[PDB]
Design a protein around this nucleic acid. Sequence first.
RNA 1: GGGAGCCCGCCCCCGGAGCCCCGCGGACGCUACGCCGCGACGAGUAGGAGGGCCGCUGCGGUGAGCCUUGAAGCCUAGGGC
RNA 2: GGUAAGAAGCCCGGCUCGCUGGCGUGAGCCGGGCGUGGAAUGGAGUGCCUAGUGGGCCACUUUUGGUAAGCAGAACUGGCG
RNA 3: GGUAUAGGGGCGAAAGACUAAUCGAACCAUCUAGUAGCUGGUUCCCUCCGAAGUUUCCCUCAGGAUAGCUGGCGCUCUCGC
RNA 4: GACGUCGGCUACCCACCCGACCCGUCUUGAAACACGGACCAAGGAGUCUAACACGUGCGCGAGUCGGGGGCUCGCACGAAAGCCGCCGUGGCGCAAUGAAGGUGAAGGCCGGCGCGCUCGCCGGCCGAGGUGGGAUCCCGAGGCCUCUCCAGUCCGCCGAGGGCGCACCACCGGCCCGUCUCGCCCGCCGCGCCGGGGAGGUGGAGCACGAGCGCACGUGUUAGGACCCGAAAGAUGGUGAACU
RNA 5: CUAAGGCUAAAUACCGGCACGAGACCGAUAGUCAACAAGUACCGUAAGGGAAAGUUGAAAAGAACUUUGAAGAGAGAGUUCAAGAGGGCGUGAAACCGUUAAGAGGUAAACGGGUGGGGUCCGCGCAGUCCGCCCGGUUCAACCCGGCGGCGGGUCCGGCCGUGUCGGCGGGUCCCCCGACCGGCGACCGGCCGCCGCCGGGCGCAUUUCCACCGCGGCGGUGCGCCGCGACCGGCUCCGGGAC
Lengths: 105, 187, 51, 147
Amino acid sequence: APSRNGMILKPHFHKDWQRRVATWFNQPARKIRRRKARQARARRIAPRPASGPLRPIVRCPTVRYHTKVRAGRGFSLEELRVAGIHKKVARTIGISVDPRRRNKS
Amino acid sequence: GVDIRHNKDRKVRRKEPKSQDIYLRLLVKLYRFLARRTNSTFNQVVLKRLFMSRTNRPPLSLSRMIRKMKLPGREGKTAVVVGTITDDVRVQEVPKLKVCALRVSSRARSRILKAGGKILTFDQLALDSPKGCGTVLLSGPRKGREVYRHFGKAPGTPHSHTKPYVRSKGRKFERARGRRASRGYKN
Amino acid sequence: LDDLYGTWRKAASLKSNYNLPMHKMLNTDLSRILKSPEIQRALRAPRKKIH
Amino acid sequence: PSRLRKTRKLRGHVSHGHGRIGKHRKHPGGRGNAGGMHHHRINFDKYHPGYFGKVGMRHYHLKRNQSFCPTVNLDKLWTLVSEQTRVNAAKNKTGAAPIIDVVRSGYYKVLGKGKLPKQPVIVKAKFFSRRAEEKIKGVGGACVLVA
RNA sequence: GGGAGCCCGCCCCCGGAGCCCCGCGGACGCUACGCCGCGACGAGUAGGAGGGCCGCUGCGGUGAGCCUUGAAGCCUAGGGC
RNA sequence: GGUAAGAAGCCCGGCUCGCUGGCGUGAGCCGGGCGUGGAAUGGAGUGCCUAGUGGGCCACUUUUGGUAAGCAGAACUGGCG
RNA sequence: GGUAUAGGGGCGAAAGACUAAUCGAACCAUCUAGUAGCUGGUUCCCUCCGAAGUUUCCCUCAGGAUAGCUGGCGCUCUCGC
RNA sequence: GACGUCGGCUACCCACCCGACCCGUCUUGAAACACGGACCAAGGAGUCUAACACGUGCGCGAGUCGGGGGCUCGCACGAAAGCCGCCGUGGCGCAAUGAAGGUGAAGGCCGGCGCGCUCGCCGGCCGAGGUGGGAUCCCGAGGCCUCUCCAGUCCGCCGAGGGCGCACCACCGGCCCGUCUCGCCCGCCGCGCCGGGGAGGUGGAGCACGAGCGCACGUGUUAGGACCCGAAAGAUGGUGAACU
RNA sequence: CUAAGGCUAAAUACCGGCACGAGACCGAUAGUCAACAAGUACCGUAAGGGAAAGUUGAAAAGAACUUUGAAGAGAGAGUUCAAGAGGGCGUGAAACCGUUAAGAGGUAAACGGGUGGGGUCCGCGCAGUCCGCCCGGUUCAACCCGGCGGCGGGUCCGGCCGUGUCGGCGGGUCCCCCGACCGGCGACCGGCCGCCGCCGGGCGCAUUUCCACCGCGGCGGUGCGCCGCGACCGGCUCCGGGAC
């Protein structure tokens, strides 16, 4: 029942949400586990970079941003061909390669 | 056997600040002594404003303080603000001032000190002018909060321009029956 | 400690954007302030002749 | 804190602060927003006018990125650039008129709200308002369109 | 400062004038969230608010705390607030 | 049961009007001169959060239906609640 | 004695009779802490303030919403200065 | 008055006088021939999460934030704490108005050019308007004096009167967006079913030199079991012809 | 982009299973139904339903032996600090019951206000006249010498320190030098003065401090219990007069 100018709201608590409540008491343990796994991988690849393969320069769609530059999925085949790098050898050397990227500009 | 309505016999005005911080209480003691000794009403007003809550002493903007000090007559007078002085980014020329306030933002403090002004606390103001001579008392806009936009005559009433409580403004959340002339009525 | 928190006229240089909080009142000793000549020069004679 | 809560002061009171003529029943008025048209119409029409009924055109696949266009007023325009840029202005006896890139600062459209100081400046933005352009021309600058 | 009055000079400082006011320093009264002085009032269900140095349990600090020369608990025709 | 018992009022001087008019109105702007406007009592004004209640009853006076009712139903005031 | 018919089903020389002391829809478990505008109950003290059964709307008449009555938080000012 | 005498308001028992019907609840009305009630011990009913609204406290402040992640530890104390070109991707606020295409918050004074045409175009200046009420602050004639008459700078209190006028209220104007009416001119890469501008009404949750963000607490409203206990019912899946 | 073919760990979830760590959680009517021979006893033909139940003692040292009784049960004796812990045995409350002591009893019992009587012990006393200051009837303060420590002060005396400005541009924000003024700020020292305190020496007795008494002499709160009287005031109910 409304009472003297309250906001009209519709809580989405009509299902059995208490059975599907997801707690986060394992967040610090999960962070510790991820940190340990990352350190283990870094020790596994002793001279290789911890982050991993190189990522290309990529711009953003959705003109909302239109200016930000981020890391790409992988280097394009035309880029590899211009640089004189074989696509299969790039994977073994540590260059991220994806075969779906286009090159308009 | 006397007919006296005790409905409003107890005055609800504040007597001491509800804050438990010690510096404000020391200032309260100082201005209590100053108000109960000196004949100036400036000390009493300052004490009453110190008693006021956070919402009752809104921050004062640098531009508003500048425009209030630019009025003819209050030349070379110290500005007294019980709230906080906040920097205004849409003003370039800031003359030197003499500002007394509980707090000043870092940007406003830098602006005032770079302009050649002086900033004083309330104890320093009491030491300088115990009775508040040569002081201009200023305060921020009390009705500046968006809370007061929802107050007054309720919406859906003729000649009412009150912002209703809406979860999110949009096309299909309001401006329908009760607001559109083509749908039922409007106010 | 100074490099961790900084003084009032210098940034922390170990915390990206932090400075020490400002004092609401500087002369915290109100006993010294109350009996100062400046204040007592503008005070009425106290009434302690309670009837 | 239950210590500071009201329920501790209601110990010993029979009705527990909810009246005794009419008990605190479970749902007397209806659950949630029940009766928007019936038995709560007065409240829904005196506090939420325009709740019922449709208006406007539907837009199925709406994207906020297409209509994203932040705006900045001439009231706060030199704040986008460093203060030393404005210090090196109205000086040097050259008419430098520095360039302020609004898109770099994060806004697309420049609006005409506020007073602009008497200092020429080159404003680059995707969109300009007529009043903002008039203010810039009167100050002595130039509006530059970018894509 | 000058001119003078119903011969000139002092007419002095509280480390001491001694006090019903002493502006030279100031409680036995100052846990200033304290203390002190005047007036007016005190009904009450539903209901609201405030204060609890009222009570139970556990936690962070603190009583150089208590305790087999006797803890909690329980009983009491004892002394009490 | 509404009003009026003055400063938010009177007396002048000058401007504006795309309204109204033969000149004139009428309204709005600015400058100046004049203060206790009947009795008695009160310190006033303003903004939000807001529980409970929405079964009442009785009494002087007026009064509806009914023969009458510790009957049913109204008006002012006061009580119980 | 064996066997067949198992619950909106069986069976009934028909009584809504029988179906494991229950039959106008058996028993056990789960949904389920099903819903109730309806009963009942609702836990320490003191202090201050302190009500209504009335307005209008609702398939409304044992209930809600809305004004009204009420409490709290304040704030703006005047002064036995 | 002092070796069987004192004081013990309160609590043990008894007597007297007055008053005095059993508690809780529904109710206009309860001691009721209204309902629950032999007695005692233990348990026992307004909680928690989420979304809001208001008020209060704190920090920063046209900004605010830690959500998530990463860097330090083998976790006693720690699943804590510190830090981040992540400090802001992102949320809220700083801009609103239209269904939308879209548009989008400032003016005034002075000199000049067009016929000052309440209109347009060139330069300079002031730069959030005005009236009334406005706590406070400034000037303040003059008065009060001081052991004698005058002159007289100083410490004062009152101070008629005159002003700048915070916050806030009422009103008048001004500005932004949608819409209606009357109208005159501007621009060109494409001279068009182009774009822009004025005045007068009106609608808006708007501007008119800002006040928000994060945390905590209190109250109220809801969704959840939702202050506790309570149905007649409904559905799903299994077990019964040992009685009949 | 290339469907009607296929493979693939990683960041993801884990109220079951194995083994661990932790708690601002409950402490035997609580916490899982289950702290114990718990899905056990038991119930229903069956699907299924489902409990109650911890504590002697440090150590059984678990009461040898005599005696009454058929025995259960006692009376002695013994162990134990404790059986006033005796095998469902730690602490052992209330309802309820038996017994001892006191009091009372024809308007059911019980309750509030006011006293009185009797007991329980409590605090006095073998007078309680409670004291605490000033005054009368064995050494040192007074005064000097030496030492030590402390406080305050200015010529800022000299040096540090320290805030605002000026200067060397000497190294937007951050550092040194001499010179000057100001706030000389409780931010520190070396000398000087004044004062105070302590120790050690003089100071031998009209001073000094102790212990006790006869003064109830001056002051203050008080009396062990029961009381009585006087004067002043305030608030009341009255009485006797005279005079207009």
